[PDB]
Enzyme design. Structure first.
Site, mmCIF file in Angstrom:
data_model
loop_
_atom_site.group_PDB
_atom_site.id
_atom_site.type_symbol
_atom_site.label_atom_id
_atom_site.label_comp_id
_atom_site.label_asym_id
_atom_site.label_seq_id
_atom_site.Cartn_x
_atom_site.Cartn_y
_atom_site.Cartn_z
ATOM 1 N N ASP A 96 0.804 -1.223 0.000
ATOM 2 C CA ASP A 96 0.000 0.000 0.000
ATOM 3 C C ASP A 96 0.837 1.273 0.000
ATOM 4 O O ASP A 96 0.282 2.366 0.178
ATOM 5 C CB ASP A 96 -0.906 0.039 1.217
ATOM 6 C CG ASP A 96 -0.120 -0.017 2.509
ATOM 7 O OD1 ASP A 96 1.131 0.015 2.481
ATOM 8 O OD2 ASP A 96 -0.735 -0.120 3.579
ATOM 9 N N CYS A 99 4.878 -0.284 2.660
ATOM 10 C CA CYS A 99 5.466 -1.607 2.884
ATOM 11 C C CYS A 99 6.902 -1.556 3.459
ATOM 12 O O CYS A 99 7.369 -2.531 4.049
ATOM 13 C CB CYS A 99 5.420 -2.494 1.602
ATOM 14 S SG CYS A 99 6.106 -1.681 0.120
ATOM 15 N N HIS A 230 8.457 -3.171 -3.974
ATOM 16 C CA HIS A 230 7.811 -3.764 -2.798
ATOM 17 C C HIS A 230 8.860 -4.301 -1.851
ATOM 18 O O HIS A 230 9.738 -5.022 -2.309
ATOM 19 C CB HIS A 230 6.932 -4.922 -3.257
ATOM 20 C CG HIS A 230 6.092 -5.528 -2.179
ATOM 21 N ND1 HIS A 230 5.432 -4.774 -1.222
ATOM 22 C CD2 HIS A 230 5.759 -6.816 -1.932
ATOM 23 C CE1 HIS A 230 4.737 -5.577 -0.431
ATOM 24 N NE2 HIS A 230 4.883 -6.814 -0.866
#
Ligand SMILES: [Cl-]
Ligand SMILES: [Cl-]
Ligand SMILES: [Cl-]
Ligand SMILES: [Cl-]
Ligand SMILES: [Cl-]
Ligand SMILES: [Cl-]
Lengths: 329, 324
Positions: A96, A99, A230
């Site tokens: 989101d 992370c 990510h």
């Protein structure tokens, strides 16, 4: 079957853990960065699955493990490449834009940063204190790799740390945010990142809490993986004879390439090896040579033993659910 | 993140609770029915969702309450008809054919019967114990039906209590299974409904002195059971009425499976197995008041270790501060 993802295993316990975190932050008045009093010393270990059967293994692995990042990093020989060392495993992390914080928080405490406690602490430091030394270090690192407007770019990076809507809910964070974060935690952060083969990312490498003396910091790192914008925690698997450690170099064909140590001043960079040995427990591990016969010693850092007590461990509660659910098959 | 079942606030704790249940079952040698040692005396209450912003009050309800069945039973004037007693609320229950047990388990322990402990306990009694007297009571009740249009019926009722696949995952259960269940629990069960499953089931294979005298209260509609729990903290009476208004008079709830001598003393039996109190309610003539019988309901008593609604409630409070 089992919970569909870690946090579901004891929601009340997670809340208790989260509620403890902001109370562990000490906010000095002499200008020293705010930092955690005790909780930064905790470390999660993942449980072994080898005792279960493939249908079961599969459901535990689909529930907890980011197998996509795990496969990407292993296939590049970046993760789990040393035969001497214990396996690390990537845990799923919410994507989101917060992370970096979710992965860091899970590595220590088995919960994500869903109350924004770490995210707010980063923004508070960047917004409310003098950050001149952080800025200088970032300038040097920026110029080591057009017209730069320093003030404007610094203000943007501060803004990126805010909880404001812009990978869509929050702005993604970058290297300087990791460095500031490790100084709030007084604990090194090591990032294992996706990166093109040299024959053909900059977020990878080692972040040291250089605003503190090494003796005031915890000397086992947090280990994160990074891919496709990510972050995930890369947690140690319970097992020896293999040893708990993370290499501080990568293979590069028939040679080795040091992990990047971020945001150093010039004199620090000259004594980088000495600095690493102060903030980490650096050991040497022999590995097979890809040029010469025999073997080469490379540096690695020791990793922490699990010490995250049951009363604050989702993974323990998770495992006990696993056992219950298992014996029924 | 506001879970849809009380147990999910703490699944580890749910497992602990379920694991305790089979160890609490005592299994006599002399043929008497197996029964709970201690756990049958537990009762859950729901927390209030008022004293929250009605906006947020409504988030919890969609999460925990079977509002479809609550509205049906209330509009039929069967549930919460009496303005003098505390409101009862229907909790969501899995509709897999084991919902009699999921509802009963949830009323006492705040967990559903997902290990099949109660379901297996029922089948065990029916397939192992002798059940001579249960069958007699069932025949008597069956033959009260004024018209009849017949004995493989008892063996199929036994089979229905098994965990075998039938359809839902399990066979649906019926009145006789409720009666056997209340005797395994040594605790009355009262079912509110509009199969004539509604009514009062007493543990008559036990002297009242060996039974818990507050009931389990369930709702039933469309082959589905739910627990009807008391809503916690105004000044209304903590009791469930043992009559309903019916066409301008009060009609007693049905009492199931009584023998003739028991029927002749029904009111005395109700007063032994329940805590009966005589309360005043408004008449149809607004100039008149009537005294009716009601049975006291238990106060919430699940201990720390296996108290779960308190864990769910804590989640709610944490989430609400962030919501303010
Ligand atoms: Cl790259
Ligand atoms: Cl690197
Ligand atoms: Cl009334
Ligand atoms: Cl009426
Ligand atoms: Cl009735
Ligand atoms: Cl009247």
């Amino acid at each position: 079957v089992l919970p569909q993802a870690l946090y579901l295993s004891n929601m009340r316990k997670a809340v208790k853990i989260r509620e403890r975190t902001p109370e562990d932050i000490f906010k000095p008045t002499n200008g020293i960065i705010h930092h955690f009093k005790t909780m930064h010393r905790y470390t999660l270990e993942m449980f072994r699955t080898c005792q279960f059967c493939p249908q079961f293994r599969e459901i535990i692995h689909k529930a907890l493990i980011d197998r996509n990042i795990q496969a990407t990093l292993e296939s590049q020989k970046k993760l789990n490449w040393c035969r001497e060392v214990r396996k690390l495993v990537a845990l799923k992390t919410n994507g989101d834009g917060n992370c970096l914080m979710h992965a860091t928080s899970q590595y220590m405490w088995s919960v994500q940063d869903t109350d924004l406690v770490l995210r707010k602490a980063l923004f508070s430091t960047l917004k409310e204190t003098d950050t001149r030394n952080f800025k200088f270090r970032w300038q040097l690192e920026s110029l080591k790799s057009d017209t730069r407007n320093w003030n404007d770019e610094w203000d943007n990076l501060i803004k990126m740390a805010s909880t404001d809507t812009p990978g869509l809910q929050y702005n993604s964070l970058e290297e300087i945010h990791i460095f500031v974060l490790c100084n709030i935690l007084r604990r090194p952060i090591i990032v294992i990142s996706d990166k093109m083969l040299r024959s053909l990312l900059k977020v990878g490498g080692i972040y040291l809490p250089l605003h503190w003396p090494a003796q005031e910091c915890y000397r086992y790192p947090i280990v994160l993986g990074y891919d496709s914008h990510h972050f995930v925690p890369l947690v140690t698997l319970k097992d020896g004879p293999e040893i708990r450690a993370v290499p501080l170099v990568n293979r590069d064909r028939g040679r080795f390439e040091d992990l990047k140590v971020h945001f150093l001043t010039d004199p620090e960079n000259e004594m980088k090896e000495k600095l690493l040995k102060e903030y980490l427990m650096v050991i040497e591990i022999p590995v097979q040579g890809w040029d010469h016969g025999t073997t080469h010693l490379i540096n690695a850092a020791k990793l922490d033993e699990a010490n995250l007590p049951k009363e604050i461990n989702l993974v323990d509660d998770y495992f006990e659910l696993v056992q219950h659910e298992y014996k029924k098959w």
